[PDB]
Amino acid sequence: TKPFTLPILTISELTNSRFPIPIEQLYTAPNENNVVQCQNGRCTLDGELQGTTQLLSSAVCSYRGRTVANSGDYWDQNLLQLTYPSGASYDPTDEVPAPLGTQDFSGILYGVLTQDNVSEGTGEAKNAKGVYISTTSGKFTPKIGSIGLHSITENVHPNQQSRFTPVGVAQNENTPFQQWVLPHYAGALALNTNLAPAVAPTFPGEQLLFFRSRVPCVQGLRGQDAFIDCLLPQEWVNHFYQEAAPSQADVALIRYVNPDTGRTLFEAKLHRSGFITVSHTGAYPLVVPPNGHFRFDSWVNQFYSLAPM
Amino acid sequence: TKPFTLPILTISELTNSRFPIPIEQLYTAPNENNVVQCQNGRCTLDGELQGTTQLLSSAVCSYRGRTVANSGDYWDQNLLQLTYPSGASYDPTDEVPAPLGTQDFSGILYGVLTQDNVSEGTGEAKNAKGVYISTTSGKFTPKIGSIGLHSITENVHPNQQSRFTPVGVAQNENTPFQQWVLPHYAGALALNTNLAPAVAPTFPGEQLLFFRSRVPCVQGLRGQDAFIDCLLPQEWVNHFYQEAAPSQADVALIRYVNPDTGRTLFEAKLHRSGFITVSHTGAYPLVVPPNGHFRFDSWVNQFYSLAPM
């Protein structure tokens, strides 16, 4: 039986699985009213990708396809007829919530659309268009293969093969950024399908442990931080996919260790569905040694008692 | 002794190590007048990172720091005084060619600068500034901890903590995109230092094999492609770093296989310094089967004679 392992990576060597930026810190908090059901960065410990999860950070919140004119709409002047960010054709009957890498938070995603290359004499950055992709728009239906593009300053051409590169997130006065409210992948008139399950602590005193990043915010949240919290770093997703080690229990005991001193800084529970819990009550940003990393200890029973941290 | 392995990844499951976009195909050509000395995606088979190579694709061609106003009527309206991912000033005495992840191609890099968050009422994408970072500017001195920012869209504010997210590449009438001309990391008046070595075939009939991507081009190259070719995909760099398997010969004989049939499509030499050669004469794009992947076969010496492909 292939033993289960974690990659040996420090907190500065991890990528957020829900937005293509590095992990900044570990963070724990109670769920209070949030339903924690993100769809990117979802992978079982034995290597089954779930939700909209794929292997490349450069595909997370990225889109590719062909633009379609949508003149007359207030918000979305054009649509993007999607494929997978792979470039492989997208079939709405695929058993996924949306094309892999589709944004899994509610609100406005900001990025740059690139289209057919233009001549040098056309001018600077004339094949770059700043664009909003909002999930509250009626045209956000990636499950059906089409999303709406809100142009900001630059003209988006119809009928051109186009690539959307994410840059950050946005918040205006009627569209709050809500990282734990799933989009309606098929529009407000249809239920989501093929979702990775919601996660929550099930042992007394435990809280979810998140891998936290601050995403750039191009509008709103003055003096505040746009946080995107993921359950697994992209590197863990890819490691579990590569290894496909059979899971021997619902929960694995893991430790954050200093490899030079051998000290366990804290213990945590790694759950089969692909998330972590720690024994703590309250919102708490962890600070962890630059050389520290998680290590797999053993498979334990669901009601194993972690050392408080 | 820890056996050497490659990750099991198809061509579309690989990330370019020189720009955060997926690999699309393989490519081989003679060096003729190109000095092949890229500094990102450089890693020995036993896991030693070289040049400016680090582990996160989300850090390649990404920059962070504090803006400083630049006087005069010239190309760069602002400078970016660089900082580590923690916010501490960069150290020019580090034995590296430049901060890790610095762009290693000459020409114009395009992306979006984000700064202090602005209120919701300030307007759409008002904390997003489209920007050119040109290596032919006298202000491109990342080794010294400062790069020049040419504003295109939105005003860049000085004295603000800022992040640069890369989107693509550009070419105007006097700045060609030259992927094999290393930038002068300390400006045009200083020699590069601490470089990973240039690579070339040394066995008769062999050519370098590259992992090839098409990078978005926001100005120029109409009807043409901006290619970025790397020696190793980011996933191979990270795998070798993780495994740190001792190299047992000068060359790891590797084989591209189609798992549906078990058939070998071609074989290649994976040199212990971290680059691939194949037996071929001429420029040739390799459209590889989408389900295929490289596999490590065995250790051989530098005088192994590859089967021509």
Both tokens of residue A120? Answer: 């040098």
Provide the CA B49 distance to its chain's centre, in angstroms. Answer: 13
> Based on the domain organization, do A40 and A103 belong to the same domain?
no
* Positive/negative CA dihedral, B303, B305, B308, B309: negative
CB pairs under 8 A between A and B: 168
Instruction: Give the residue from chain A lying closest to B127, CA to CA.
Output: A218
Structure tokens at A296: 């797999």
Beta strands A284-285 and B217-219: pairing type?
A: unpaired
Which are the contacts of B309, defined by CB distance < 8 A and separation ≥ 6?
B265, B266, B267, B278, B279, B280
Judged by a CB distance cut-off of 8 A, whether residue B218 touches chain A is yes
Q: Measured between CB atoms, does B125 come within 8 Å of chain A? A: yes
- Does B177 lie in the same domain as B158? no
Residue A136 tokens read as 């509250």
Distance CA B235, CA B294 (A): 13
Number of domains in chain B: 2
- CATH code, A200: 2.40.510.10
- Regarding whether A267 and A209 lie in a shared domain, the answer is yes
CB atoms under 10 Å from CB of A191, counted, come to: 8
**Residue among B15, B123, B224 minimizing CB distance to A58:** B15
Give chain B's length.
Answer: 309
Interface test with B, best of A61, A120, A126 (most B CBs within 10 A): A120
One domain for residues B190 and B303:
yes
Of A146, A170, A194, the last residue of a domain is: A170
* Method for this entry: X-ray
Q: How far are the Cα atoms of A302, B147, B156 from residue B82, in angstroms, in the given order?
A: 47, 8, 16
Q: How far apart are CA B20 and CA A22, in angstroms?
A: 13
| Closest CA relative to residue A48, chosen from A273, A249, A233, A232 | A273
The DSSP result for B15-60, as a single string, is: B-SSSSSB--EEEEE--TT-----SSS-B-TTS-B-TT--S-GGGT
Query: What are the DSSP E strand ranges found in A33-145?
Result: 63-69, 78-82, 108-114, 129-134
Does the beta-carbon distance from A114 to B59 stay under 8 Å?
no
The residue among A170, A194, A229 that closes a domain is: A170
Residues A144 and A70 in one domain: yes
Contact A22 B85 (CB under 8 A): yes
Tell me the C-alpha distance between A288 and B110, whole Å.
35
Q: Which residues of B253-290 are buried (b: 16+ CB within 10 A; e: fewer)?
A: bbbbbeeeeeeeebbbbbbbbbbbbbbbeeeeebebbe
- Residue that finishes a domain, picked among B170, B193, B223: B170
Same domain, B76 and B164: yes
> Cα dist. B52→A184, B39, B195, B242 in Å?
42, 5, 8, 18
List the one residue out of B167, B194, B188 whose CA is nearest residue B49.
B194
Q: A36 with A18: CB under 8 angstroms?
A: no
Say whether both B53 and B64 belong to one domain: no
CATH of residue B110: 2.40.30.120
**CA-angle at A162, arms to A158 and A164, nearest 5°:** 120
Q: Please identify among residues 92-121 of chain B the ones whose CB lies closer than 8 Å to any CB of chain A.
A: 110, 112, 114, 116-121
**Are B10 and B107 within one domain?**
no
Q: A223 vs B20: CB contact, 8 Å cut-off?
A: no
A106: left (phi over 0), alpha (psi -120 to 50) or beta: beta
Q: Are residues B24 and B92 in the same domain?
A: no
Cβ atoms within 10 A of the Cβ of B173, count? 10
Is residue B180 located within the same domain as residue B276? Answer: yes
Chain-centre distance of CA A256, in angstroms?
A: 23
A52 and A68 share one domain: no
**What are the structure tokens assigned to B242, written together?**
């993780």
Decide: helix, strand or coil at residue A212. strand
Provide DSSP, chain B.
-PPP------GGG-B-SSSSSB--EEEEE--TT-----SSS-B-TTS-B-TT--S-GGGTT-EEEEEEE--SSSS-SEEEEEB-TTSPBP-TTSSSSSSTT---SBSEEEEEEE-S---GGG-TTTT-EEEEEETTSTT-BGGGTEEEEEEEESPPPSSSEEEEEEEEEE-BTTB--BTTS---TT-TTS---SPPPP----STTEEEEEEEEEPPEEES-TTS--EEEESS-HHHHHHHHHH-PPP-SSEEEEEEEETTTTEEEEEEEEETTTEEEEE--S-EEE---TT-EEEEEEEE-TT--PPP-
Can you read off the two tokens belonging to residue A14? 């991890």
Range of the domain at B42: 1-59+171-309
Same structural domain, A120 and A239? no
Contact (CB, 8 A) for A30 and A281:
yes
